[PDB]
């Protein structure tokens, strides 16, 4: 139901955040 | 009420993630 | 219950976003 849907939304946000952390790591690698 | 608030908070996180994706993509290309 | 759990997940995501925003701000100073 809707609670499960909200949990799926949270899971999707976590994956988005992880992806951005990878991008930041790459930018730091390029910098130093 | 708390459920409505949680959904608003999720919407706000999606907007922040979008802004971050943009800033990262811009930085990777040296586009300001 | 489930709503309290979701609120805790959202709180964690908000901290993660804050950290990313800081890192991106710092990288912009580094690169530009």
Structural shape of chain A: rod-shaped
Gyration radius from CA atoms of chain A, angstroms:
14 Å
Number of domains of chain A: 1
Residue share in β-strands of chain A? under 5%
Give the largest interface. B-C, 14 and 14 residues
Alpha carbon gap, first and last residue of chain A:
47 Å
In this structure, how is the largest beta sheet of chain A organized? Answer: none
Oligomeric state of this protein: homotrimer
Percent of residues in helices of chain A: over 70%
What is shown here, in short?
Helix content of chain A is 94%, strand content 0%. The first copy, chain A, has 32 residues and is an all-alpha fold. At the A-C interface, helix 1 of A face helix 1 of C.
Key words describing this protein structure:
homotrimer, 32 residues, mainly alpha, de novo protein, trimeric, coiled-coil peptide CC-PIL
Describe what you observe in this structure.
Three copies of one chain form a homotrimer. Chain A is mainly alpha-helical and 32 residues long. Chain A has one domain. Chain A contains one helix and no strands. The longest helix of chain A has 30 residues, at 2-31. The first copy, chain A, is rod-shaped. The interface between B and C is medium-sized, with 14 and 14 residues.
Helix and strand layout, with pairings?
The structure is a homotrimer of 32-residue chains.
Chain A: H1 2-31
């Amino acid at each position: 139901g809707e609670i499960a849907a909200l949990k799926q939304e949270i899971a999707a946000l976590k994956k988005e955040i992880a992806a951005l952390k990878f991008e930041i790591a790459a930018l730091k690698q390029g910098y130093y």
